[PDB]
C-alpha cells in the first residue's frame, strides 16, 4: 500500500492510501532544550511530544512558507512519521508527496534525493497541494483556494487541465495570522514573545477568532458593547479577555496590508486569477470556488468570500463557495484518493528511473 | 563506596552513599575555652563534644549562610567527620559534598582544594543542596524550597532542566530565626547572650514554635487567653514560660520585615520564581512545591505555604505542598541517591583532572 | 511654550520645548520608609529626593518595561516634574509625552486621561520615542535603536515614513542588565538585595561595564591576568574589584540566553528589523544605524555594533553606526525639537476634541 | 508643666520641662537599718538620706540593670522624687518616663498602673533612653552609645528612623565596673564587702579610674614606675594607693571578658550595630557616635573609642565621637525638650484611654 | 621529694607528698612569755611547745584571715616546721605552699621572697586551697566550699575549669566562731578573755558545738528542757555547761548578722557562686558541692547545706552534698596529690628563673 504524507509547514498528514483520515496527524516541529540538565532526556523532540515539552524548549518549523529551510530537521520529522507514528519500513511503501505550486527547484529535488537515497522507498511522487483537494471534492472543474499555515495559493482547473499562467501564489497563511495576533493581543497588555507561547497564540487563534461579514460595522459593534468580547484561560490559569481581536486577526486575509503587505486579499487574488483564465470557463469558476487547509476553517469566511467575489464580479454569474466540513484535511484526502486510482500506478517515480536520471526526474514526472 | 557530605550552615549531615539515613548528625560548631585551666582539655572541641561542653566554650559556627568563612575551623570539622565519626580513610572514597546556590566561587574553589590537598580524596563532587532535594522526593519536576540553619532558596526544575535565571536565594533561615527569638524572649525577662545559651534558643524553637494558619487571628488567640502558653524547662530547673513567640518566631519566614529585611516572604518569593518560569510549566510547578530542611519542620508551614500561594495563583491552578515527614534529611538522602546511579559515575572530578586544571575544574564540572 | 518630559522607565528628563537640554533629570522612582519613626518626615520621597534617603526607604519603579504600573506612584511622580523640578503651572503649557512602540493602550489613554483631568493642560500628545531620537539626529532616514532602562526598541525610517511591521521591540533594556550584574557579582561574594542596593549596583554598571569587541577572547584575557579588573568603593568605604563583570553585564544585550531570554541579540534584532524592510530602502538603512539611550552608552557598544551587523548585511553594505555624544538626551532633544515645530501645531491634542472623544482621541492622534 | 524623670538604675534624674538641668539628682537608694535602735529613726531612709546614714543600713537598688526588681522599694523612691525632691502633686502633671531597649513588657506596664493608680498622673509616656540623648545633641542622625549604671546600649537613628534590629543591649555598666573594682582592690589588701563600702568604691571609680589609649602600653608603664599611681582618703582618714586598678576598671569596658563575659567591647559592639544598618547610611552613623551616661565619662573613653572603631571601619571613613561635655544628664535633656515639644503633646498616654485599654495601651503608644 | 606545706590561719599541715596524711600537724602560733623569769626558758615558742606552756604566754597568730600580718613570726613557724617538725633540709625539697583566693598579691610575693632566700628552696608553688580540695576528692567538676580557721572561700570548678568570676571569699571562719562563742560564753557568767582562754574556747567549739537543722525550732527545744545542755570540765578542774550556745555558735556560718557582718550565709554564697556560673554547668555544680577545711567539721552542716541549698535551687535539680569524712585534711591532701603528678613537674618556679624575674614570677606561673 501507498503511503501519503502531507508536509505542511505546520502540521505533518501521514497515513496509508484508501483510508478517509490521516492516521498521524501532529505538529511540524523539532524542539531542543534551551536550559541546562541537572538531573542525572534528549537532544531533540520532535512532534508531540516536543509540544508537551515545549515550556523548556525553543520550538523550531523546518518549513517556512511551504520551503523546507532545514534539511537536517525535515529528515527528522519525516523518521519520526515513519518509524514513530505509522510504524511502517519505507523501503516498501511508495510515497506519496504534496507541494504548493510555484515553489524553488531544489525544495522538490532534495526531497526526491532523501526519499530515495535517506529511506530507500521504492517509488515516490510530488503532487500540488491544491489540485489534490479537487481530487477530494469529487470535482474535475473548479478554482481551489487553499490556505494553510504557510502559503496561500490558488489553482483553477477546468476539466482536469490546470492553467499555470493564472496560478496565483500568496506568502500569507496561519503562521502570519499568529504572528499578527501576538502583535495586537499587546495592545490589551499580553505579551507573547517565546516560541511556546506563540503555540498558545495560535490556540487562541483557532478557538476565538472568526471573520466578520461586514469589518467596518463589526469595528463599531466592538466598540460600542463587549458583546463580541470572549475569555480565554491560559495554561497557568491566567484568564484573558479578547474583543475585536478575534476578527481583526482573520481580516488580514482580506487586508494585507494590516502586516505590511502590499499584496490583494484572497478575494481579490480569486477573482484575478479567474480573470486570467478564458472568459469561456470563468462562469464554472466561479460557481466551484474549493476552499481547503486549516486557514479557511474560520467561522464566517465562506461567507465573507461569498460577499467579496459577488461584488466583484458580474451580477449575472452564480458565486458559490464550497467549504466542506472536512476541508482541513482535503489534501491528504484527496493524496489518499489520487495514490489509490488504477490509472495513478504508472505516474510514480521508481527508484530504477531515479538511479539513471538524478534527483532531475521529478522535474519531468511532476507537475 | 562513595561518601556522601552534607556541610549545612547548622549541621553536618555525612555518610555512605546507598544507605537511607545519614550515619553522622552533628552540630558544624567548633568551641574554644574561655576561662582558665587550673587541673593538671583540648584546644578546641567540635561537634557533640563542644555541644556537652558549652558551658565553658565560645561556640564558633564555621559556615555562615552557607558560606565558609572560617576555613582552618571548616578543615576541623571535615577532619572530625572522615576521622571520628564516620571513621574512614577520605584517601579511598569518592566525596560528594553539597553547597546552596548563588554562592561565591571561591566557596566551592577552596573546598576542591582542601578535598584534594588535604584529605587527598580519589574523587568530588559539588551539588546543589534543592537538587539533591527533588531526587529524594522521586521526581523530576518541581520547585524545591530548601530552608536550613543559614539559607532560603528555591530552585524551579522541570523534566530534569533547571531555570537558573529563576532560582531565589534568601539570607534568612534558620539562625536568625533563633536570633530573633532571642530578642523577644526578653520581653518576658529571658535574658539569652551568650553563643551557649543560643543553643538553649534553638532547642526551645525546635521544640515550641509553630506557624499559625492566620497570624493575625492567632495574635487575638494568644492575647484573650493561656490557651497557647506552654513551658520550657532550662538546663539549670528554671522553667520559662512562652505564649505567642511560639508562632511569632516562625512568622519572620513570611514576614521578613519583622527582622528588618526587605525581602518578600517564603510564599512570595515562591510565587516569584515561578512567574519566573516559562508559561507553559507553572502548573506543574504549582503542583509539585517540594519543601526540604530543618526550617521547613516547623507544625502548620504546610498548610500556611498552601494557603499563601493558593493566594497568589490563580484560583484554577491545583497548588499542592510537598511536605515529605523525612524532608529535614532530604539533601543527603538525595545526595546519597545521587552518588549511587551508574550514570553519574562519569561526573566526579577525578584528581587525574584536578591536577592539570587546578580549582578552577570545579566550575566547568558542576552546577 | 511646550513642556518637554520624556518619562522613561528609569529617568524623567523634563523641560521646555526649544531649549538644547532637559532642565531637570531625576530618578522615576518613589520612596516609602520602611523603618519606624521615633523622632517628632514624610509619608513618601520622589525622585532625588527619595535616592538620598534610600538607606532608609523602599524603593518603587512606577514604570516598568515602559509600561506605567502604579498609576498613584507616577502621578506623584508628574506632580514632583511640574510643580518642584520644573516649577512650573500645567494649565498653561501643552505637554509632550513619549512612549515605547508597541505599548498596551491603555497605558497612553490613561496618560491622556490625568494629563487632561489631573493636571488640566491645554494640549498634549504623545510620540514615539524612536522618532524623537531621528529628529534629534538631523535626519529623516534611519533605523533607531533606543535602549532606555526598560525597553530596547527598533524603529525603521526611510524619508519620514515608517515601517510598522518592521518595528521590534525588546524587554531587555538597563534594569535587566543592573539585575544580571547583581547576580554574578555574587560570584565574588558581594551580596546586594535591598532597592537601595541595586541603585548601587547601577552606579557600577554605569562607571566600570564596558562591551568587548570579541567576547570569548576578552574572557581569556581576563583569565588571564588582572589587567581588566578594576575598583569601586561602596557608599560606606568598602572596596570592591571587579574583573569580566565589567563586560559580560553589556555581553547580555548581544546574548540575552544570559539571562534566560530566548529572543535574539540587539544586532541580529537590528538586522531582523531591515530584513523586513523593503529591498529598495535597505542600504539606506544599513549606513544610518542611530544608537540612542542610556543602555547604549557603554564603551565599545558602537564598535562592537558595526562588528555584528557587517558580519550579517552583505559584504558590499555600508555599515555605519551613528552614536552620538549626547545620545542619552536624544529622545527629549528630539521631542524638544518637535514641539517646536511650526508644522507640529496642528498635531496637539486639544481639551476641546478631548472633552467629545473621551481618552480614545491620543489612538486616531498619535502614532 | 511636664515631669521629667529619668529612673537610672544608679541616679535619679527629675526636673520640669523646660528646664536645662534636672532639679533633683540623687541615687536611687533604698536603705533599711540593719542594727538595734537603743535611743527612744525611720523604717528605711531613701536617696541622700540612706546615702549620708549607710554606715549602719543595708542599701538596696531597686532597679538593677534597668529592671525594676523590687515595686515596692520603687514605689518609695518615686514617692520621695515628687513629695520631698521636686514637692509637686503628680495629680496635675504629665510624667515623662525614661527605660532601657529591650526590657521585659511587664517593666513598662507596671510602670504605667502605677503611675496611674498610685499617682494618678493624668498622663504619662515611657521614652527609650538613647532617643533622648539624641534629642539633646540636637541632631536627627546618629548612632547613640548610652552607658550607665546598669545597661549599656547602641541605638542607630537616622532621619528620625530607628532601626530596631540594630539595636544592642550589654547587661554591662557602671555596677558591674565597680564590683570589679572592689575585686581586684583585694589585690593590694583593700577589703570592701558590704553595700556601704560598695559606695567608696564607686566613689573612687568616679575620681581615679580612666581609660588607657593602649591597655597593654600602659600595662607595662605602671610596671616600671608609680608615675601613675594616685592616693584617695577613706571615709576614716585611711589613706590608699592604686595603680594600674585606674585604668584596668574601665578597661572592662573593651574587654567584658575580665568579668566573664563572653560579648564583645562596647567598640565592637557599636561597629557591629552599624553593620546590622543599610549600607547607605553607615557614613553618616560613623560621623555621629554619640556618648551619654555617667559610664562614657571616663578621662579618655572618647580617644579609645575613636581609635577602636577606626581600626575596625574602612580607613576613608571620618569617624567623629560625640561626647558632650554634659552627656551625664543628656537623657533627662533630650527628655526635657521632647516632654516641651508641641508636636509631643498628641503622644501622652492619658488617664482616659488608660482606663479603656489597661496598662497595655503603654504598648501601642510608646516605642 | 617534694613538701606540701598548708599554712593556714589556724593550724600548719606539713608532709612529703606521695603520703595520704600530713606528717606534722600543729597549730600556727607563736607565744612569748608575759611575765619575769626568776629561776636561773627561750625567747618565744612556736606550736605544740607554744600551746602547752600557753599559761604563761601571750599567743599570737601570725597569718589571719588568710592573710600574712607577721613576717618575722610566719618565718619562725616555717623554720620550726621544716627542722623541727619535719626534720629536712630545705634546700633539696621543691616546696608545694597554699594560699586563699583573692588575697594581696604582696602576701604571695613575700612568700616567694622568703622560701628562695632565707631557706633555699630549688623550687616552690603557691597553689589556691580550694582546688586542692577537689584533687583530693578525685573530680574534675564541682565547687568547693572551703572552711578552715581565717577564710571561707567558694571556687566553682567545670571540667578543670575555674570560673574565677565566681569565686567567692567570705573573712568568717573558725576564729571568728571561737570569738563569737566566747562572747555568748558570757552570758553563763564564764569569763575568757586572755589568747591562752581563746584556746580552750576553741575546744569547746570542737567538741559540743554542732548545727542545728532548723534553728528556730531548736531554739524553742533548749528553751523547753535541758536535753541539749552538756558539761565540759576545764583545765582547773571546773565544770561548765551549756546548752543553746552550741548551734548558736556555727549558726553564724548560715546568720553572718550574729556576728554584725553585713554578708550572706554559706548557703546564699554558695548558690549565689553557682548562679553566677554559665547556665549549662549548674547542674553539675549542684551535684557537686564538695566541702573542705575544719570549719565544716560541725555535725549537721551538710545537712543543713543541703536542706538550705534546696530551699534556693530549682525543685528539679539534685542537691549533693559531698562531704569527706577526713575533709579536714583535704587541701593538704590534693597538694599531695598535684606534687605528685608528671604533669606538674613543669609547673614548679625553678630558682634560676626566680632569679631572672623577682619575686614577681609568682603572678605569671601560678593561680
Ligand atoms: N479552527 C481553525 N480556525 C482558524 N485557523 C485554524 C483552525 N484550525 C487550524 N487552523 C490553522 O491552519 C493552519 C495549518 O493548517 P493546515 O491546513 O494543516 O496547514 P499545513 O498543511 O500548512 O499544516 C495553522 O496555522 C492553524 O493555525
Ligand atoms: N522541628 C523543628 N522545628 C523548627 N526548626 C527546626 C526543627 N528541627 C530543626 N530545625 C532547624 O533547622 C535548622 C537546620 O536544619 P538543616 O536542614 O540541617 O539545615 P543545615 O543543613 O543548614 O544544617 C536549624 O536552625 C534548626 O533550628
Ligand atoms: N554610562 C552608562 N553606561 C551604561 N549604562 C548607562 C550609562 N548611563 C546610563 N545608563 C543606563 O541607561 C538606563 C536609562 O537611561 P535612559 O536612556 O534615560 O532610559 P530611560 O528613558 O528608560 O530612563 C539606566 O538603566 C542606566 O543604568
Ligand atoms: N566621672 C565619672 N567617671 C566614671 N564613671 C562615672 C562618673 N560619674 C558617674 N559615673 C558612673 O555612671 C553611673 C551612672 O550614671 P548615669 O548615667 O546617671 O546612669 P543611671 O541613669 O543608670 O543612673 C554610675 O555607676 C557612676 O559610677
Ligand atoms: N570537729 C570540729 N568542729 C568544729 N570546728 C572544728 C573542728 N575541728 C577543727 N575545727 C576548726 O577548724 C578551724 C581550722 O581548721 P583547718 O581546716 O585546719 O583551717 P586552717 O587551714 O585555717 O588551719 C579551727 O578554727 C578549728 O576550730
Ligand atoms: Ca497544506
Ligand atoms: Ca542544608
Ligand atoms: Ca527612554
Ligand atoms: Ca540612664
Ligand atoms: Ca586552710
Same mark, same amino acid.
Given at each position: 500500500?501507498?503511503?501519503?504524507?502531507?508536509?505542511?509547514?505546520?502540521?505533518?498528514?501521514?497515513?496509508?492510501?484508501?483510508?478517509?483520515?490521516?492516521?498521524?496527524?501532529?505538529?511540524?516541529?523539532?524542539?531542543?532544550?534551551?536550559?541546562?540538565?541537572? $538531573?542525572?532526556?534528549?537532544?531533540?523532540?520532535?512532534?508531540?511530544?516536543?509540544?508537551?515539552?515545549?515550556?523548556?524548549?525553543?520550538?523550531?518549523?523546518?518549513?517556512?512558507?511551504?520551503?523546507?529551510?532545514?534539511?537536517?530537521? =525535515?529528515?527528522?520529522?519525516?523518521?519520526?512519521?515513519?518509524?514513530?507514528?505509522?510504524?511502517?519500513? *519505507?523501503?516498501?511503501?511508495?510515497?506519496?508527496?504534496?507541494?504548493?505550486?510555484?515553489?524553488?527547484?531544489?525544495?522538490?529535488?532534495?526531497?526526491?534525493?532523501? $526519499?530515495?537515497?535517506?529511506?530507500?522507498? *521504492?517509488?515516490?511522487?510530488?503532487?500540488?497541494?491544491?489540485?489534490?483537494?479537487?481530487?477530494? !471534492?469529487? @470535482?474535475?472543474?473548479?478554482?481551489?483556494?487553499?490556505?494553510?499555515?504557510?502559503?496561500?495559493?490558488?489553482?483553477?482547473?477546468?476539466?482536469?487541465?490546470?492553467?499555470?499562467?493564472?496560478?496565483?501564489?500568496?506568502?500569507?497563511?496561519?503562521?502570519?495570522?499568529?504572528?499578527?495576533? =501576538?502583535?495586537?493581543?499587546?495592545?490589551?497588555?499580553? !505579551?507573547?514573545?517565546?516560541?511556546?507561547?506563540?503555540?498558545?497564540?495560535?490556540?487562541?487563534?483557532?478557538?476565538?477568532?472568526?471573520?466578520?461579514?461586514?469589518?467596518?460595522?463589526?469595528?463599531?459593534?466592538?466598540?460600542?458593547?463587549?458583546?463580541?468580547?470572549?475569555?480565554?484561560?491560559? *495554561?497557568?490559569?491566567?484568564?484573558?479577555?479578547?474583543?475585536?481581536?478575534?476578527? @481583526?486577526?482573520?481580516?488580514?486575509?482580506?487586508?494585507?496590508?494590516?502586516?505590511?503587505?502590499?499584496?490583494?486579499?484572497?478575494?481579490?487574488?480569486?477573482?484575478? !486569477?479567474? =480573470?486570467?483564465?478564458?472568459?469561456?470557463?470563468?462562469?464554472?469558476?466561479?460557481?466551484?470556488?474549493?476552499?481547503?487547509?486549516?486557514?479557511? =476553517?474560520?467561522?464566517?469566511?465562506?461567507?465573507?468570500?461569498?460577499?467579496?467575489?459577488?461584488?466583484?464580479?458580474?451580477?449575472?454569474?452564480?458565486?458559490?463557495?464550497?467549504?466542506?466540513?472536512? @476541508?482541513?484535511?482535503?489534501?491528504?484526502?484527496?493524496?489518499?484518493?489520487?495514490?489509490?486510482? !488504477?490509472?495513478?500506478?504508472? $505516474?510514480?517515480?521508481?527508484?530504477?528511473?531515479?538511479?539513471?536520471?538524478?534527483?532531475?526526474?521529478?522535474?519531468?514526472?511532476?507537475?
Amino acid at each position: 500500500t501507498a503511503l501519503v504524507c502531507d508536509n505542511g509547514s505546520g502540521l505533518v498528514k501521514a497515513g496509508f492510501a484508501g483510508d478517509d483520515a490521516p492516521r498521524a496527524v501532529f505538529p511540524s516541529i523539532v524542539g531542543r532544550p534551551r536550559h541546562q540538565g541537572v $538531573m542525572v532526556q534528549k537532544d531533540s523532540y520532535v512532534g508531540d511530544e516536543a509540544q508537551s515539552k515545549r515550556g523548556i524548549l525553543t520550538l523550531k518549523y523546518p518549513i517556512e512558507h511551504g520551503i523546507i529551510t532545514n534539511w537536517d530537521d =525535515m529528515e527528522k520529522i519525516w523518521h519520526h512519521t515513519f518509524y514513530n507514528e505509522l510504524r511502517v519500513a *519505507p523501503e516498501e511503501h511508495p510515497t506519496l508527496l504534496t507541494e504548493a505550486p510555484l515553489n524553488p527547484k531544489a525544495n522538490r529535488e532534495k526531497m526526491t534525493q532523501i $526519499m530515495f537515497e535517506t529511506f530507500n522507498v *521504492p517509488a515516490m511522487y510530488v503532487a500540488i497541494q491544491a489540485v489534490l483537494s479537487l481530487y477530494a !471534492s469529487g @470535482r474535475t472543474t473548479g478554482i481551489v483556494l487553499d490556505s494553510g499555515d504557510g502559503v496561500t495559493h490558488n489553482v483553477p482547473i477546468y476539466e482536469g487541465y490546470a492553467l499555470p499562467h493564472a496560478i496565483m501564489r500568496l506568502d500569507l497563511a496561519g503562521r502570519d495570522l499568529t504572528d499578527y495576533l =501576538m502583535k495586537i493581543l499587546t495592545e490589551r497588555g499580553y !505579551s507573547f514573545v517565546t516560541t511556546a507561547e506563540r503555540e498558545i497564540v495560535r490556540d487562541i487563534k483557532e478557538k476565538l477568532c472568526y471573520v466578520a461579514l461586514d469589518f467596518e460595522n463589526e469595528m463599531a459593534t466592538a466598540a460600542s458593547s463587549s458583546s463580541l468580547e470572549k475569555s480565554y484561560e491560559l *495554561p497557568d490559569g491566567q484568564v484573558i479577555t479578547i474583543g475585536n481581536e478575534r476578527f @481583526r486577526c482573520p481580516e488580514t486575509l482580506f487586508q494585507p496590508s494590516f502586516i505590511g503587505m502590499e499584496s490583494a486579499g484572497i478575494h481579490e487574488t480569486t477573482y484575478n !486569477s479567474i =480573470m486570467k483564465c478564458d472568459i469561456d470557463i470563468r462562469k464554472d469558476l466561479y460557481a466551484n470556488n474549493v476552499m481547503s487547509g486549516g486557514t479557511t =476553517m474560520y467561522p464566517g469566511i465562506a461567507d465573507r468570500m461569498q460577499k467579496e467575489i459577488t461584488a466583484l464580479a458580474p451580477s449575472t454569474m452564480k458565486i458559490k463557495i464550497i467549504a466542506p466540513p472536512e @476541508r482541513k484535511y482535503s489534501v491528504w484526502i484527496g493524496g489518499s484518493i489520487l495514490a489509490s486510482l !488504477s490509472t495513478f500506478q504508472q $505516474m510514480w517515480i521508481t527508484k530504477q528511473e531515479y538511479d539513471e536520471a538524478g534527483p532531475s526526474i521529478v522535474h519531468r514526472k511532476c507537475f
